[PDB]
Design an enzyme around this catalytic site. Structure first.
Site, PDB file in Angstrom:
ATOM      1  N   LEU A  38       0.818  -1.192  -0.136  1.00  0.00           N
ATOM      2  CA  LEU A  38      -0.034   0.117   0.025  1.00  0.00           C
ATOM      3  C   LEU A  38       0.782   1.396  -0.056  1.00  0.00           C
ATOM      4  CD1 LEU A  38      -2.873  -0.989   2.592  1.00  0.00           C
ATOM      5  CD2 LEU A  38      -2.943  -0.945   0.039  1.00  0.00           C
ATOM      6  N   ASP A  39       0.483   2.232  -0.704  1.00  0.00           N
ATOM      7  CA  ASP A  39       0.842   3.587  -0.790  1.00  0.00           C
ATOM      8  C   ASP A  39       0.741   4.156   0.830  1.00  0.00           C
ATOM      9  OD1 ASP A  39       2.512   5.402  -2.741  1.00  0.00           O
ATOM     10  OD2 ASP A  39       0.957   6.760  -1.701  1.00  0.00           O
ATOM     11  N   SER A  40       1.294   5.414   0.810  1.00  0.00           N
ATOM     12  CA  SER A  40       1.089   6.040   2.123  1.00  0.00           C
ATOM     13  C   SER A  40      -0.359   6.820   2.160  1.00  0.00           C
ATOM     14  CB  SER A  40       2.373   7.108   2.478  1.00  0.00           C
ATOM     15  OG  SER A  40       3.556   6.469   2.580  1.00  0.00           O
TER      16      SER A  40
END
Ligand code: PC1
Ligand code: PC1
Ligand code: ZMP
Ligand code: SF4
Lengths: 82, 98, 156, 110, 114
Positions: A38-40
């Protein structure tokens, strides 16, 4: 909000509503960055889904320290009675 | 009794039944109440003109004026309700249950 | 025939009523608004042609784009054009409304109001004199005069 | 009778002009147009001042309703009582106006 | 090499301001789709906000991302306060533009540009 079990079930229900998290690999102690991929910004819209569900504001210097659903349910337990 | 008086009484009871079964709004209550006042004006006027009773002809105007002033009071009450909740809904007027 | 004559006379009637009662919504954008004001001033006097002064946009008949159309106001121009009842007409007044004018190569200027609205009469000048704006209004009236609405209705 | 015929003719001419004003340009097949003002999606805030001037109209209109039979009351035999009550009603209308004055009721629409 | 900061002393506070700006845009997308009566979905607008945040993601300068947060707050202020019209919001969605050719061969076929 009464028990830790209802809060944990509601955390896992929020994170299985979210489309990019795979619900098979989604566990209680699953990390967001290195495990779930997951991205931030994905983690931040996760925290805003948690704010939409649990009904309170989560600040910034303690949502950076929510990297797994176990720390999420432990934080909501810390910010409530349970 | 008579016929057109029975019609004006029928209108009074119909606006009474509308005044006794609230749907949503307080303005509907005030409108049914003033329809009742209107029917009282009509029926008093037809009686007073029928008997040729002269001094009572000022009576419906009196029956108008006071009651119209009464309606003004009701409108002001509605306004204060609509200044607290934003709507004139009768279900916002339930804080006096306890 | 007979019906061709009837639709021709009724075309003459409705064209007469529309051209002799044009109501303008003037966009006071820039310097051309001053010369529109001189066209409404007593010497040239649009009102004696049936052309009233400052009609409201929701009943006006012709939109006079008088001045520079910039990029910040072009959606407002198209909005007021879309709020006009038909038959609406557009008179473009001056060089900035015609093709961008003195600000043609600018970053912020719509290069002609005919990129935004369908334009009927192009009035040239910087600014065109009020006599020339009145010439454009009368040329618009002659364009309305030769319309063939009921004739083309009867022929379609 | 003539009054009812006149009201009916005025109502018929009014409805006829409204019906002509709606159905005559709907002969046209002009354009079906799309894409629907100083507010876009704002609610209406209530204003207390407009309601105050409406209720002030209603109360002075009731006082005028009392004042209306004066051209008939001038013909009475007890003119001293009639004059006292006429002046008393107009004085109470004036006292209502002065109380509307001094309690800032006539302000920002004075 | 010593410069005056704008708001952030380092990239920690800078990413904090980026993160709270993304929180505000995420809270503002559904209202923007509603009151502008847009033809997009809320997920599609959030995809566009994700694209606008991932476009500038490679910036390692704290002052530059301070000014990017400032300009994003200005875009947010023009969107919350209804100053943009429908056109200014739909300009992020390049709909009337044809998609540009990305490979070498079709760019060779259509013109002279790289
Ligand atoms: C007393 C006070 C004033 C009373 C009113 C004035 C008196 C005259 C009233 C009738 C005027 C003429 C008809 C209305 C105007 C029609 C204009 C128009 O656009 O017509 C084209 C229209 C439609 O033409 P169209 O088919 O080209 O449609 C144009 C729209 N597109 C192309 C996009 C589809 O014609 C009609 O609808 C016919 C109307 C009746 C024609 C005359 C019949 C006899 C009438 C007596
Ligand atoms: C404050 C009140 C001011 C007005 C007082 C009455 C003035 C008047 O016309 O009185 C004569 C009138 C009538 O007298 P009159 O002179 O018209 O009598 C002639 C006889 N009739 C009426 C049949 C034509 O009233 C009275 O005499 C008694 C009624 C008033 C009693 C006092 C009321 C005080 C209210 C305070 C609140
Ligand atoms: C309706 C649509 C409206 C569109 C909205 C337009 C908003 C535009 C606002 C632009 C604001 C920015 O671009 S600031 C982002 C730049 N940040 C940086 O360069 C610092 C690096 N930041 C990141 O990597 C960010 O993803 C995070 C979330 C702060 C950290 O992620 P990393 O971990 O991986
Ligand atoms: S065409 Fe020229 S003179 Fe006319 S409004 Fe434009 S800038 Fe002013």
């Amino acid at each position: 909000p009464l028990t830790l079990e209802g809060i944990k079930d509601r955390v896992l229900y929020v994170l299985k509503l979210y489309d990019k998290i795979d619900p098979e690999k989604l566990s209680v102690n699953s990390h967001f960055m290195k495990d779930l991929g997951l991205d931030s910004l994905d983690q931040v819209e996760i925290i805003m889904a948690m704010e939409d569900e649990f009904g309170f504001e989560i600040p910034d210097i303690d949502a950076e320290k929510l990297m797994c659903p176990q720390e999420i349910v432990d934080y909501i337990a810390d910010k409530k009675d349970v | 009794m008579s016929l057109v008086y029975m019609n004006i009484m029928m209108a009074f009871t119909v606006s009474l039944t509308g005044l006794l079964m609230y749907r949503s709004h307080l303005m509907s209550s005030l409108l049914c109440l003033e329809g009742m006042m209107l029917s009282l004006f009509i029926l008093a006027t037809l009686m007073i003109l029928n008997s040729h009773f002269t001094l009572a002809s000022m009576m419906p105007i009196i029956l108008l004026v006071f009651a119209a002033c009464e309606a003004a009071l009701g409108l002001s009450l509605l306004v204060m309700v609509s200044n607290t909740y934003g709507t004139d809904y009768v279900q916002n007027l339930n804080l006096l249950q306890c | 025939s007979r019906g061709e004559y009837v639709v021709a006379k009724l075309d003459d009637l409705i064209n007469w009523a529309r051209r002799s009662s044009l109501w303008p919504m003037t966009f006071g954008l820039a310097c051309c608004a001053v010369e529109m004001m001189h066209m409404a001033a007593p010497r040239y006097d649009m009102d004696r042609f049936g052309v009233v002064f400052r009609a409201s946009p929701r009943q006006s008949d012709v939109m006079i784009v008088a001045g520079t159309l910039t990029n910040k106001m072009a959606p407002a121009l198209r909005k007021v054009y879309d709020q006009m009842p038909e038959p609406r007409y557009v008179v473009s007044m001056g060089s900035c409304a015609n093709g961008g004018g003195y600000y043609h190569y600018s970053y912020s200027v719509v290069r002609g109001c005919d990129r935004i609205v369908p334009v009927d009469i192009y009035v040239p000048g910087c600014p065109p004199t009020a006599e020339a704006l009145l010439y454009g209004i009368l040329q618009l009236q002659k364009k309305i005069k030769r319309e063939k609405r009921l004739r083309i209705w009867y022929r379609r | 009778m003539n009054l009812m015929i006149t009201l009916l003719t005025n109502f018929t001419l009014a409805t006829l002009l409204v019906t002509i004003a709606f159905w005559l340009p709907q002969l046209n097949v002009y354009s079906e147009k799309t894409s629907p003002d100083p507010m876009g999606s704002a609610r209406l805030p209530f204003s207390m001042k407009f309601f105050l001037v409406a209720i002030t109209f209603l109360l002075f209109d009731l006082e005028i309703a009392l004042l209306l039979p004066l051209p008939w009351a001038s013909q009475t035999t007890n003119l001293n009582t009639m004059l006292t009550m006429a002046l008393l009603l107009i004085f109470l209308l004036a006292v209502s106006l002065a109380y509307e004055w001094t309690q800032k009721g006539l302000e920002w629409t004075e | 090499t010593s410069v005056k900061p704008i708001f952030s002393r380092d990239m920690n506070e800078a990413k904090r301001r980026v993160r709270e700006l993304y929180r505000a845009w995420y809270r503002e997308v559904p209202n923007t789709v509603h009151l502008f009566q847009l033809d997009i979905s809320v997920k599609q607008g959030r995809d566009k906000v994700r694209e606008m945040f991932k476009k500038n993601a490679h910036v390692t300068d704290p002052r530059v991302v301070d000014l990017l947060v400032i300009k994003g707050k200005m875009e947010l202020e023009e969107t919350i306060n209804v100053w943009k019209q429908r056109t200014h919001v739909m300009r992020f969605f390049h709909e009337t533009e044809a998609p540009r050719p990305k490979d070498f061969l079709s760019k060779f076929y259509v013109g002279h540009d790289p």
